Structures are given as C-alpha cells and as structure tokens.
Design a binder for these strands. Sequence first.
DNA 1: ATCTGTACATGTACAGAT
DNA 2: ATCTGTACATGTACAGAT
DNA 3: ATCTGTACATGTACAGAT
DNA 4: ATCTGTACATGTACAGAT
Lengths: 340, 356
Amino acid sequence: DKLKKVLDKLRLKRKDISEAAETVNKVVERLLRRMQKRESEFKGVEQLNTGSYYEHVKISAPNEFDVMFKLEVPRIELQEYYETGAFYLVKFPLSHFVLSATKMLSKFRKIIKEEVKEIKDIDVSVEKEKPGSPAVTLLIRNPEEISVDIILALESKGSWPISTKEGLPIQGWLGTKVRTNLRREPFYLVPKQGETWRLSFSHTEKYILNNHGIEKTCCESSGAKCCRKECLKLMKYLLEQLKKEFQELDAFCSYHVKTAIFHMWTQDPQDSQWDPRNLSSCFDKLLAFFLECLRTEKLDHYFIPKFNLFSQELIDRKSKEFLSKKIEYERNNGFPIFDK
Amino acid sequence: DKLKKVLDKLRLKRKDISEAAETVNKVVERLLRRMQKRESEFKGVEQLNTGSYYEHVKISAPNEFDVMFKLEVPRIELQEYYETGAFYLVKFKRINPLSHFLEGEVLSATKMLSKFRKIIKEEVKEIKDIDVSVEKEKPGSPAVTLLIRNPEEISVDIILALESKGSWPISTKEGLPIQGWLGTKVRTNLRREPFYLVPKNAKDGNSFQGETWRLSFSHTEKYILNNHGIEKTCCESSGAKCCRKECLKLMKYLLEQLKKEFQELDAFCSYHVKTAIFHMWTQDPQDSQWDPRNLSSCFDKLLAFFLECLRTEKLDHYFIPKFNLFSQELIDRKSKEFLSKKIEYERNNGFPIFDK
DNA sequence: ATCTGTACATGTACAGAT
DNA sequence: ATCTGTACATGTACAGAT
DNA sequence: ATCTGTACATGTACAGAT
DNA sequence: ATCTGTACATGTACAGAT
Ligand SMILES: Nc1ncnc2c1ncn2[C@@H]1O[C@H](COP(=O)(O)OP(=O)(O)OP(=O)(O)O)[C@@H](O)[C@H]1O
Ligand SMILES: Nc1ncnc2c1ncn2[C@@H]1O[C@H](COP(=O)(O)OP(=O)(O)OP(=O)(O)O)[C@@H](O)[C@H]1O
Ligand SMILES: [Mn+2]
Ligand SMILES: [Mn+2]
Ligand SMILES: [Mn+2]
Ligand SMILES: [Mn+2]
Ligand SMILES: [Zn+2]
Ligand SMILES: [Zn+2]
C-alpha cells in the first residue's frame, strides 16, 4: 500500500519524457556529428546510451541522461595500476595523447564546449569540470533542468582483463550461456593518476536490467511481472532523499545501490522471490543487505570482485555509520522521508 | 528406470563420434572450398550445420549428418505457390552469377540443384583417401546425399539453401508461438535472423515443378533445441536438468524402429516427431513439467498428443500454421490409422520394440 | 609498402567417460 | 564428481594480392 | 560509409471488467 | 483495489538503399 503509493509518485510522466527526450536527442545528435565528420581525433566515435533513463529505472523526473561516445582502438596493451583491479595504464591519430586519459579528455571537452557555443536554439551550457569525473556534463534548460553526461570511452574488442575473471557471477541466475556471450562483447575504459583509465560495464549493466529474470518471460507481455526494478527505484529514492538532507552522505552515489542490488539479484535468483505481492519484504531484505554491506564495510564491484566500493580508502567509517543510522531510522518508522 | 536404460543404448559413444566427425568434416571442408573456386555460381556459399547431430538428439549411432550450404541472395521477391504457405516461386528484380538458372525472372530450383549436384559429384570423384560416393537422387529431397564407408556407413545431406535477410514471409506471422515459453524478446530476435529456401524438387507433374522452393527453419530449430527452457539455466552446469531432449530421443526411436520394420510407415519421418514435440513444449512451457523423475509420464503425454494428431489428421507446421503435415493430401488415413494402432500397442504393452 | 580472405587462436557449453 | 573431445563464436595473423 | 524504414521491445495512461 | 485491453510514446537493432 505505502510502497505502491511511493512508486506512483516516482513514476515519470509520459509527456515529461517526450519533451526532455527530444531536446536531449537534438543536442546529442549535433555533438556526435561534430565529432567524426570534422576530422577530429574522435572520428568514428559511436553512441551508446547508458544509465537509469535507458534501463527504465529513472525516478521522479527525466532530468539526467548518460551517453557514452565510444571509440574503437587498435589492440592496445593494458597494465593494471598497483593492483586496484579497476584502473589501468594504456599503451600501444591519437598519438597526440602512454595514452594519457586527461590529455584525451581535455581535447574531447574542448570540442564539445566549442560546439555548445554554436547552439543558438536550446539553452545549453557546459558544467565546470569536476576533477577525476570522466564526464563532460551539459546543463540543458528546457523550462526544466536536465543533466547530460557525455562519457568518452575507449572500446577494446579482446578478452576482458583478468581482474574480472571471477566477476559477473550470473551462472546460477542468468546462466553460463548468457555470461559467456556477455563476456564476448567489448569492454570499455573511461578516464579517472592523470593517465589512469577505469573499466566500464554500463553496456553489460544495461543488458542485465532489461534481461533480469531467471525466466526468459520475466516482465514481458506473456510472462509474469516481478518487482526487481521497483526495489531498485525505492532504494534509489531513499538514498536520494537522504543525500539531499545530509552533506555527510556526499560520498555515496546511486551506483552503490545499483551494485548492492546486483548482488541481491544473484543471491536470490528465483523470480518468485521477487513477486509483486511481496514488494514490502523484498525492499526490506534489500535494506538489510545494504546495512550488512555498511557494517562489514564491504561492497565489491560486481564485475571486479577485488575492488571494494566501501573500503575505508574511499569512504570513512563514520560516513557508513552515519548512513547506517539514518537508514535504520527510516526502516523502523515507516519511512517518514518518503512523504516529503 | 526402463526408460533410463533405453537412453543408455541410444547414447552415442565418444569413440564413434570422433571417427565419424573426423571424416565428415574433411569431406565437407573440401566440398565447401570447391564451391568458392573459379567461376562457380556458388562462390560465397557458407556452411551451417543442422539437424539432430548438432542439436544433440541423434540416437544409436553418429551415422547421419545434415549440413546447409547457404547462399545469400539479395534483391529477391517471393510469390507464394497456391496459398500453401510453405512453397514459393523466387523472382529477381534486376536482370548475376545465378542468371544461368533464370527462366524469365523466375529462378529454377532443379536447374540450380543439378549444377550443385554435378559439382559435388566431381569433387567426390577426386577424393581418393576416403570411400565416399553420391547417392542416386531421391525425388522430393533438396539434398545431395553422401554415403561414406568409414568402414561403418555414414550419410551426409548437403542441402542447398538460399538465404534471405528480409523479414519472414507473412505465412509465418502466426507461427513460432514461443511467447509463453521462450518469450517475446527471443521471438523477435529469432525472426530477425535470415530465412532459407530449399528446393522442393518433386517430380509430381504439377505446374511450376522445377521452380518451387520450400521454406526451411533448421537454423531456428537448432537454436530452440539448444535453448529449450523457460529458465535461462535449464540443463546448464548451475541449473536444473530437464528431460525435454530425452523425450524427443525416445520418440524418435519409437518411430525409427517401427519405420525399420513396416513399409506402411514410409510417409512418416522424424520431422513429424520434432514438430509434435515443439507443440508439446509450447503447451507445457514450465521446466517443471519436464522433470527427469517424470520421464515416463512426459514421454506418455507426448505419445497421447501424437496419437490425437494422427487420429484427427492435424499436425500444423510449427512455423507455418496453415500448413498441415498430416492432411489427407500428404498421407492416407489408412497410413495414419496403422501407425496409431502400432503406437497404441507399444504404449499399452510395455514398449516391446525398445528391446529389439 | 599496405590490404584482406582465409585460416589459426582462444574460450567454453554440451555431454560422454571415468 | 572430475576429466575431456567436439562444435562454434569471435578475435587476430599473415601469405599473397593490391 | 551514412542514413531511413521497419518492427516491436520497454514504458506511460486509462477505461472497463473483475 | 487489481487485471485486461487499447492507445500512445520513445529506444534500439539491422536490412537495404545511397
Ligand atoms: N563509480 C562507478 N563505477 C562504475 N560505473 C559507474 C560508476 N558511476 C557510474 N557508473 C556508470 O555510469 C552510469 C551512469 O551513472 P549515474 O551516476 O548517472 O547513475 P544511474 O545508474 O544512471 O542512475 P541515476 O542517474 O538515476 O542516479 C551507471 O549506471 C554506471 O553504468
Ligand atoms: N519435411 C521437412 N520440412 C521441413 N524441414 C524439414 C523437413 N525434413 C527435414 N527438415 C529439416 O531438416 C533437418 C534434417 O532432417 P533429418 O531428416 O536429418 O532429421 P533430423 O531432425 O536431423 O533427425 P534424424 O536424422 O536423426 O532422424 C531437420 O532437423 C529439419 O530442420
Ligand atoms: Mn543517470
Ligand atoms: Mn550521470
Ligand atoms: Mn539428421
Ligand atoms: Mn537428413
Ligand atoms: Zn521482471
Ligand atoms: Zn533442459
């Protein structure tokens, strides 16, 4: 009852989706065309849409869109950075940039910013660079505000790096044939010290969000609806509302929630453990899983098992205890935060 | 248990598989390479292994392989032959290495098959390290069949096929009803794969005889056989074993044994049995209706179903709903009744034909 | 010199063998 | 249970062609 | 190489039926 | 309340034309 009503509030409106999408598509098409057909270092960059809007787990409003501009590279040589699992040096047009990530991002960002100056028909600016973040972020102002993250990424077509050998443990859930095929796809590197890139599996996570049942018919027109995505949306909402209220939660992001629920989906593969009539206890067992991650300070990258997203190197113990207390409070009081 | 022991007799032996597959691949690789030579009209033909051996339902011995030599054919327009749903005339838009077989835009199937056969016969002649010959042509067969004496006898059907990448012919819009079983995403992807036309090659005396092609979906059936569960992990190393393929084997065997004994059953073929079970798998989508512990009553329900198809004279092509493989036009009532009595007899007497 | 159809190289599900 | 041969999907090398 | 056309997936929206 | 059926909307894969 309660959680149904929250999900109705979170649902995007069809009209709001139509307006944001056609503005976003205008800017993205024009930027993609400024690459390639202008003999840049990024000729041949191809588009791939990623993230919550395209996985259909976006909540509240269509106000944030993620796009990769992926660029195939002749067979590069990778070297793992100091055993971090997820970060790598890259070695061997592009000779203008060891393939320095910051050097290549800056030219990328220099092109985007120039093309945005010549957009006289949409209110669109380029957000001040956030260091380390791999994105070039656009603030579009429809009558409403929309973020777009243009993520530069190298596409490599060989075996996945060995730090992922034990990753993606879908064998008992989506199965071995799905896993083998997923791992036959390319992998991607995005910018993160100034020469380091980071692995990306946004394409693999997109497939999983839209192929998320042990049953091939899960959530199709001739199958049964499950509540996996609704739990992702609810857990996403709880963290969004808590990040607004508390600056102490600045080090948490939605990817932390995404990763935890990939683990829950793997720990509980059956589609009937995610029946829509059991939406409450499903969401509760996700809260308890997420609190177990905080207490043990352990949340492994789903594709890179040794990379702990909750290591003290990245998040202070106090931040996790703070979030642990705030989540425990919303849990034991009917989620008052969902009504504001 | 009794059915468990039949499957062990039906189980292929890896030693036999190894020697059969070594010879068969040597011959096919050499025929395929010959097709790419000179001004051969079949340049660019590609190989696609189909049928029971590659679905892992081949029984008793590895002694019959099917392989498709498919040739992609671009601007192609199709005329359904007399509302049959499965048979087509193939016409060409622009007036081409295949022009040698045209007859005013209409592409002759038996002209193409003859040139295919002649080339195959010639390459078989120059194979000196293997005892292989080319079977006398069989009417209604799209295939050029090789007999190998590897000491043991081995049949190989080289099937000539046209490959069209366009959307499937509308006679199939209602076919492949896998929405409640393998689902709609699977169905949409499957129907984005090409479709194939093989020569009908009948000598019936009917009009358009040598210019009639038949639709083929061996490629879609290979996928289904090897991805047969509602659950993605069905029969995988971290999932539950089902008995779907084991039922198909037991039924294939019932028909093979009876066909071996009774000339009356010449009109029947293993595809009837494959088709019947695709309907049974659609009817019973859940993996739990194909539990290994209920192999007996699973095999029994597929029998009851096959009997109803023989008696009511209705077994729809899985992909072309309006094509009835058991119409009276194709098989006599007398032939269907005879098989119905024989299946009944085995069913209610402990299957004594398994012990032969 | 580069290009490219052909064939080797790699990895793993499937199921037979032990 | 683990070891293992065949089939097949996709990446990559390179002899011969340009 | 680039771009449109097509089909049907994933959604939202709502009335009528349960 | 939910379930079913139809309208409406965008996203995505790829054939075929240029
Ligand atoms: N720390 C990270 N490590 C790896 N991939 C990440 C990380 N952060 C983001 N991504 C990838 O980028 C995508 C876009 O991330 P973003 O921050 O927009 O969140 P999201 O999943 O799209 O959801 P939302 O925007 O609604 O919070 C993610 O879905 C994920 O694939
Ligand atoms: N009458 C038919 N109509 C349509 N497709 C057919 C027909 N006969 C055969 N096929 C196709 O050709 C394939 C090869 O036929 P074949 O007679 O070898 O049987 P099979 O399914 O391979 O089994 P087995 O040879 O072990 O009896 C079949 O799997 C099917 O895809
Ligand atoms: Mn997003
Ligand atoms: Mn983002
Ligand atoms: Mn066969
Ligand atoms: Mn055959
Ligand atoms: Zn679902
Ligand atoms: Zn199975």
